[PDB]
Amino acid sequence: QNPMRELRIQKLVLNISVGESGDRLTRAAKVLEQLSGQTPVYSKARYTVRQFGIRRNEKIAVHVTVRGPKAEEILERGLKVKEYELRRRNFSETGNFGFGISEHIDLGIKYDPSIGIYGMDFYCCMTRPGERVAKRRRCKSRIGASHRITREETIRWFKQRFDGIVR
């Protein structure tokens, strides 16, 4: 019996880690603005390391989150680049998955020389309906054993919906 346990897309989170401060961030931020439609966020280097050449509290990366039909269509563009094929090792034991691309214009952005070329990281998180119980402020609790997702379901769900393949 599965009356209402159909998976959905809570959100899609994507990030770019250039690894060095300066105007590269500002132009990289502009990329996310045109792609998503929202305004992005700046991170802060937690631990300084001379080797990589980064100091603490120095912005080095950007990311944005999307939910709803926008998330669906952005995910669809990404998978079209990846040829509707993923590796079996891209799925967590808890039910999540993600991947990455190499050059940001495998989809349509109509390259301009005044920006450059970048790469993006996609990570997509599943869930079952009814997870407010673990995020509401009053009378919080943990979802029961039976009602949590494991790795075999998500790959099963992914294969049928997109008619993909895993190696």
């Binding site: 966020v41 802060k44 631990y47 300084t48 390391v49 001379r50």
Partner: peptide
């Protein structure tokens, strides 16, 4: 255009690279 507030805490007044000591 907004700055994320890191959850992680660090010693109030220290200027140290992360102490690892493991692997190389």
């Amino acid at each position: 255009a907004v700055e994320k507030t890191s959850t992680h805490t660090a010693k109030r007044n220290t200027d140290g690279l992360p102490p690892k000591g493991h692997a190389a």
